[PDB]
Design a protein around this nucleic acid. Structure first.
Ligand SMILES: [Mg+2]
Ligand SMILES: [Mg+2]
Ligand SMILES: [Mg+2]
Ligand SMILES: [Mg+2]
Ligand SMILES: [Mg+2]
Ligand SMILES: [Mg+2]
Ligand SMILES: [Mg+2]
Ligand SMILES: [Mg+2]
Ligand SMILES: [Mg+2]
Ligand SMILES: [Mg+2]
Ligand SMILES: [Mg+2]
Ligand SMILES: [Mg+2]
Ligand SMILES: [Mg+2]
Ligand SMILES: [Mg+2]
Ligand SMILES: [Mg+2]
Ligand SMILES: [Mg+2]
Ligand SMILES: [Mg+2]
Ligand SMILES: [Mg+2]
Ligand SMILES: [Mg+2]
Ligand SMILES: [Mg+2]
Ligand SMILES: [Mg+2]
Ligand SMILES: [Mg+2]
Ligand SMILES: [Mg+2]
Ligand SMILES: [Mg+2]
Ligand SMILES: [Mg+2]
Ligand SMILES: [Mg+2]
Ligand SMILES: [Mg+2]
Ligand SMILES: [Mg+2]
Ligand SMILES: [Mg+2]
Ligand SMILES: [Mg+2]
Ligand SMILES: [Mg+2]
Ligand SMILES: [Mg+2]
Ligand SMILES: [Mg+2]
Ligand SMILES: [Mg+2]
Ligand SMILES: [Zn+2]
Lengths: 86, 60, 52, 134, 105, 135, 50, 122
RNA sequence: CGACUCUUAGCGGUGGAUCACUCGGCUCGUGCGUCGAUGAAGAACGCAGCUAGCUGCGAGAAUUAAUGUGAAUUGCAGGACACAUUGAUCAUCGACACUUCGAACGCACUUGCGGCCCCGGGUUCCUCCCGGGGCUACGCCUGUCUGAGCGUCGCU
RNA sequence: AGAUCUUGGUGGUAGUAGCAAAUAUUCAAACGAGAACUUUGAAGGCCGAAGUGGAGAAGGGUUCCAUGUGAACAGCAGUUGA
RNA sequence: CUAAGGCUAAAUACCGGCACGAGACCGAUAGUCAACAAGUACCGUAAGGGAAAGUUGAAAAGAACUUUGAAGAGAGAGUUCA
RNA sequence: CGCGACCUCAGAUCAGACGUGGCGACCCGCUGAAUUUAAGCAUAUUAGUCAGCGGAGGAGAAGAAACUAACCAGGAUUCCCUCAGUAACGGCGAGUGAACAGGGAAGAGCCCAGCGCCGAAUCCCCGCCCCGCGGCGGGGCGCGGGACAUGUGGCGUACGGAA
């Protein structure tokens, strides 16, 4: 039986969590993430899915460093200085 | 019974308790709770009483 | 966005329309019909000194 | 009218700024007129509302000449609480009725060094404007 | 399908033209920016002429335009030599020079 | 030449694209050698290259690379240009001599394909529909 | 299962911690617009990602 | 009775560490009170003690960092955390001296044929 | 006479149309046009007295310092805060700090295991155990040191 | 007014089909506003050791345990409950 | 004209980013998928797919208290201009 | 029958630097369809376009003629108007399709190798001293190392140049 009876035999996970991108697409047997291609240096990105690009593009996360860069650009990336003490 | 940092091992727990409570410990058992914390059962040396140590800590 | 929002009008026709508007502005019936409340204005082609 | 191309007259933008203003400019937004006597004494017109000054209500249900001390400047709801401006609720307890600071008039200021400094700054700017426009 | 008399028309709209459409809503802004740049440059070179170096008198090439005359790129080295101006001082004093132009006549 | 990398020579489509053999790469072998040298030494800058020998199956080139952060390069004008960020991976953007030869650049009637800087620039200019404000 | 890795256990710990109702005092805040935790998960209705 | 950052800057390393240790001990006692119920005042003191710990630690770190900057001032090689962190590209770009130095041919051109200030009558 | 059914109307339900509103979009224009091994984007896990999400933050964790401002925050509680032997909040943000993955960098991971150099302790220098700190990726440039060659030579 | 149109809502059908695979329940009491279903006791039965018993792997992820509630859910109910 | 070596600003481009301004545009089935804890809930092993969901009141003044019921829920009373 | 010089290679957690990855609207280099149109269809068209790969910057690319022309001649590149749906290509079918001149926006020019001359005049690194810190420079000192005659620097580049 290709349906209900066969659905009882699925007890072995193909994919696990990926240590990059945190997605449950890390093919264990191929040792490769189907979303980011983790062992590859470069991120898996395709122009035939703009929705997938915008799901994980820059700005969809925290931008911990880029927010500070955007703020610091407005003052010429000054360093080593402090405001005049009161 | 203490709730400890998840990255601390038995040696570190033993030294921490020994330093900041000035007591000698017999052994340390460690588990990680289902809520993600780490719980340490620290058995003291026989000459130390867990009851009055707990009294002076303030967890009576 | 390429709806062709703008129209170009002949310069002679634009000048013609300016002339018509100016000529109509000196007729009390037309200014009254625009509803500008000219009943105590001394002279409709109202000209004041350059001090203004 | 407005000519500066860097200030907006957009209704949605002005409302967004007003309702998401941080508290340090909500303080400026929540300003109140001074009385005629205070306006004569200090050459200023309006003053940001303060915790311990006495005001009187000039609009709404609590109009009158009674002078009440402010007891709370609740900037999150853009309101202030006054001493006797309160109502009974169902279970018999009294709750303060928040009213907008633009609907009161300040009759006595809570004065310290900062309030005094702001007062002379505003008066000096007004005097400079009068001398420029004389 | 053709319908009665008409002109055989060949629109060049078979090549996905709507991805490459250049609108001109920034034309007034571009004119403003160019005017501002012109004024800023004129202020920068304060007594010097705003348009720039003097240009030579130049006859237009083909038989359609050889009756007209216009401004060239720069004065030729023969012109500068017989006028007594150094080809390296002319640009400093505001004379455009064109080393690759010859004088046939 | 450049064999088309299709399985079993099947280029599924119209017969004009059935070609597998006798196809040719648009860039020259000198440009390919420059690209390989630059890709290996990504910290250096390809300046030029020249032919040193060839076999029936191999061509040999020598590529000049410049370290853009050496002080001898960096303190000398007339060489500081290669240190600019715009001048990185010239061999990959086709800005060296060998890579430039394949872009069809030049002056005059033989090189109308690249008026505007490149073939793509000329194509965009010639295929863009200018819709003014006043038509 | 009973055998599990530390990372899986930590993932499940976070899920357990965040599967709880909202505090009662949230609804008293100024301009709350929150009625209940709409991200509640039941172990039998919907299954976790892993 | 809070502790301020201003009066902590005059103190030296030993009593700064001592006060940090006292604050840490008090914070541990406050956590004990929190788990054993305690009082609302002792619960509210937790944030105060945590911010005091942060204040002492940042004063210590700032003092150590400025001492290191003074020590490494005027040295050819400095630690990376002491070097400026403008931007990766800004650090790669040329410095002022090698940006503005010119060739002998170029400066001879500038000396011999400088740009002149001139006006043209109409 | 009733029930039932139909039509109409009043009232009441069910439902959320219409209208009014709008801290949202869409479009156009302007000025800038700045990421990352000094560790980016992204991800994970944590951090609040009461806090699940969102937001903010990183073991200094809904923030520290500094500067400006000048009496609040607020849902409740608590406690500051002579605002002058300096100051709540907010904003700015140039000092400091910034967990684990990730180009991700000792090796490896649906796990774990090393090596080298210092420091402290159990030891009472001698190197075993424990803790802490710093290093240990690939490619490549200049230089350095150590070398290889029945490569080319010189002297013997 | 139509597009087996799109989204949402609502009827007749209709208190209808149905709540019928694996033999089976009964008596008394307690708690409780409320008991065919909960608990305790008694009785009659079933699984019959290749089990309806006792424990694991994978998978689930807190379902485990105690206390409390009776909104919704457990296609009747519930004082019981994954 | 002088190839097979090299550099070079401006005028030009800009559906990503930072910060702004505006509109004969749309007005919660519209306008971005997203006016809201939206690339969220949820679905699929995965690549990927992907919603619904705005409005008390000026102010909570959000119905004290009495009464029937085990409660849900009612009858009074009360707040409010409603 | 060892010791040296050079050459060509190797190792190092050697001293000091640099590259990697992201974004990718605009830009550069490649690769590159088919749906579609031709009322069928194979060349053609779609289209050097979608998809795919690599590389940048605030712009990029291009760029100072081995040019256009044939005139009484113009004079780097880029962009706009026009040339022009034209010359031309095309089962000369469907369809495709520039350039020159002209008018404007902007306008900026230059450097090597070589040929030669000048006692390598040249450059990097490391120690010392002084003036400075704010992107790490200036000056001087070293019988201090190295690169370099298998060629550094100055003059000089087709508009000629040198003595
Ligand atoms: Mg099947
Ligand atoms: Mg398998
Ligand atoms: Mg264990
Ligand atoms: Mg074809
Ligand atoms: Mg299930
Ligand atoms: Mg020279
Ligand atoms: Mg009705
Ligand atoms: Mg502060
Ligand atoms: Mg293993
Ligand atoms: Mg030998
Ligand atoms: Mg209809
Ligand atoms: Mg029935
Ligand atoms: Mg039945
Ligand atoms: Mg039996
Ligand atoms: Mg069993
Ligand atoms: Mg149970
Ligand atoms: Mg039921
Ligand atoms: Mg919508
Ligand atoms: Mg509506
Ligand atoms: Mg009920
Ligand atoms: Mg009404
Ligand atoms: Mg090293
Ligand atoms: Mg066809
Ligand atoms: Mg057809
Ligand atoms: Mg067909
Ligand atoms: Mg593409
Ligand atoms: Mg890259
Ligand atoms: Mg360029
Ligand atoms: Mg170029
Ligand atoms: Mg030339
Ligand atoms: Mg025509
Ligand atoms: Mg074509
Ligand atoms: Mg001009
Ligand atoms: Mg020479
Ligand atoms: Zn992945």
């Amino acid at each position: 039986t290709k349906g209900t009876s066969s659905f009882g035999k699925r007890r072995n996970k193909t994919h696990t969590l990926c240590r990059r991108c945190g997605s449950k697409a890390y093919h264990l047997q191929k040792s490769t993430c189907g979303k980011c291609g983790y062992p590859a240096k470069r991120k898996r990105k395709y122009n035939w899915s703009a929705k997938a690009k915008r799901r994980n593009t820059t700005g969809t996360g925290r931008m911990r460093h880029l927010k500070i860069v955007y703020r610091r650009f407005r003052h010429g990336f000054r360093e080593g200085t402090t405001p005049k003490p009161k | 019974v203490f709730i400890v940092d998840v990255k601390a091992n038995k040696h570190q727990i033993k030294q921490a308790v020994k330093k900041l409570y000035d007591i000698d410990v017999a052994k340390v058992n460690t588990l990680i709770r289902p809520d993600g914390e780490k719980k340490a059962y620290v058995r003291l040396a026989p000459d130390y009483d867990a009851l009055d140590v707990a009294n002076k800590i303030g967890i009576i | 966005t390429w709806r062709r929002w703008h129209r170009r009008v002949n310069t002679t026709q634009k000048r013609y329309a300016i002339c018509s508007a100016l000529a109509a502005s000196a007729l009390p019936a037309l200014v009254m019909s625009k509803g500008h409340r000219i009943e105590e204005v001394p002279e409709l082609p109202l000209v004041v000194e350059d001090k203004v | 009218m407005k000519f500066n191309p860097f200030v907006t007259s957009d209704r949605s933008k002005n409302r967004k700024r007003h309702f998401n203003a941080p508290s340090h400019i909500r303080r400026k937004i929540m300003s109140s007129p001074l009385s005629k006597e205070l306006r004569q004494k200090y050459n200023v017109r309006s003053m940001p509302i303060r915790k311990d000054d006495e005001v009187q209500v000039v609009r709404g249900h609590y109009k009158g000449q009674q002078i009440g001390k402010v007891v709370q400047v609740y900037r999150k709801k853009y309101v202030i609480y006054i001493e006797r401006v309160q109502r009974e609720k169902a279970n018999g307890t009294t709750v303060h009725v928040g009213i907008h600071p633009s609907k009161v008039v300040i009759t006595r200021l809570k004065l310290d060094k900062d309030r005094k400094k702001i007062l002379e700054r505003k008066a000096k700017s007004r005097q400079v404007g009068k001398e420029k426009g004389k | 399908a053709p319908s009665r008399n008409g002109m055989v028309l060949k629109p060049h709209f078979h090549k996905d033209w709507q991805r490459r459409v250049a609108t001109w809503f920034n034309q007034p802004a571009r004119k403003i920016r160019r005017r501002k740049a012109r004024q800023a440059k004129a202020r920068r070179i304060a007594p010097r002429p705003a348009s720039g170096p003097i240009r030579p008198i130049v006859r237009c090439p083909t038989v359609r335009y050889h009756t007209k005359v216009r401004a060239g790129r720069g004065f030729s080295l023969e012109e500068l030599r017989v006028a007594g101006i150094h080809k390296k001082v002319a640009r400093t004093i505001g004379i455009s020079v064109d080393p690759r132009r010859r004088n046939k006549s | 030449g450049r064999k088309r990398p299709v399985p079993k020579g099947a280029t599924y489509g119209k017969p004009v694209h059935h070609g597998v053999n006798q196809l040719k790469f648009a860039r020259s072998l000198q440009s390919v050698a420059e690209e390989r040298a630059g890709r290996h030494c990504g910290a250096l800058r390809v300046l030029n290259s020249y032919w040193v020998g060839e076999d029936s199956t191999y061509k040999f080139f020598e590529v000049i690379l410049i370290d853009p952060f050496h002080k001898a390069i960096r303190r000398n004008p007339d060489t500081q240009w290669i240190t600019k960020p715009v001048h990185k991976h010239r061999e990959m953007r086709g800005l060296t001599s060998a890579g430039r030869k394949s872009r069809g650049l030049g002056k005059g009637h033989k090189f109308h394909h690249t008026i505007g800087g490149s073939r793509r620039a000329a194509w965009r200019r010639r295929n863009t529909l200018q819709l003014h404000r006043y038509r | 299962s009973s055998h599990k890795t530390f990372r899986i256990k930590r993932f499940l710990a976070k899920k357990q911690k965040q599967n709880r109702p909202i505090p009662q005092w949230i609804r008293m805040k100024t301009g709350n617009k929150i009625r209940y935790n709409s991200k509640r998960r039941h172990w039998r209705r919907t299954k976790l990602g892993l | 009775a809070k502790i301020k950052a201003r009066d902590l800057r005059g103190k030296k390393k030993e009593e700064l560490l001592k006060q940090l240790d006292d604050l840490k001990v008090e914070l541990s006692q406050l956590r004990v009170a929190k788990v054993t119920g305690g009082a609302a005042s002792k619960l509210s003191k937790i944030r105060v003690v945590r911010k005091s710990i942060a204040r002492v630690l940042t004063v210590i770190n700032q003092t150590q960092k400025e001492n290191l900057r003074k020590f490494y001032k005027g040295k050819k090689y400095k630690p990376l955390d002491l070097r400026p962190k403008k931007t990766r590209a800004m650090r790669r770009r040329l410095n002022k001296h090698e940006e503005n130095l010119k060739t002998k041919k170029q400066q001879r051109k500038e000396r011999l044929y400088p740009l002149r200030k001139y006006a043209v009558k109409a």
